[PDB]
Amino acid sequence: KVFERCELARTLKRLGMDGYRGIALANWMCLAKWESGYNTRATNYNAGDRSTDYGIFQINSRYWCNDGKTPGAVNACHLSCSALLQDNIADAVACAKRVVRDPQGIRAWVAWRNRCQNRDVRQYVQGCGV
């Protein structure tokens, strides 16, 4: 499913993402926009290390979810990577919350550093009623 901007913003707020571990809602929106364009079925194989990024937040199979084909992988979210490709983003959100519980926080995604950090991210939630 490809979410519309404000629809996703309202959905994430309802799932408790606003201010989670100090991360404002607009940062999660900026992250989803650049990682997948708000698309839950987005997948990206990394030929370099044989891992795959899954879903709206592009969560990696080496550390977070299990896809069975990634070498030396762990499954910290205790989920099949399949769960991160559903239209209902509840599992994806639960796993993204797990990712940021680590010391790096939102910085765990390099795309956040490149396109969101130190920027005016208000635009991502403006007019959405959140």
* Domains of the chain, start order: 1-130 (1.10.530.10)
53 as an active site residue: the answer is yes
Q: Render the chain in DSSP notation, one character per residue.
A: -B--HHHHHHHHHHTT-TTBTTB-HHHHHHHHHHHHSSBTT-EEEETTTTEEEETTTTEETTTT-B-S-STT---TT-SBGGGGGSSSTHHHHHHHHHHHTSTTGGGGSHHHHHHTTTS--GGGTTTS--
Catalytic residue among 4, 7, 18, 35: 35
Buried/exposed code over 62-85 (b: 16+ C-beta within 10 A; e: otherwise): bbbbbbeebeebebbbebebebbb
Strands of 51-54's sheet in order across: 43-46, 51-54, 59-60
Distance CA 8, CA 4 (A): 6
Distance CA 75, CA 50 (A): 15
First to last CA, the chain: 21
- With 0-12 / 13-18 / 19 or more C-beta atoms within 10 angstroms meaning exposed / middle / buried, residue 56 is buried
Which residues is 2 bridged to in the sheet?
Answer: 39
Radius of gyration of the chain (CA): 14
Catalytic residue among 53, 67, 87, 102: 53
- Resolution of the deposited coordinates, in angstroms? 1.8
4 as an active site residue: the answer is no
Is-contact 81 66, C-beta < 8 A?
A: yes
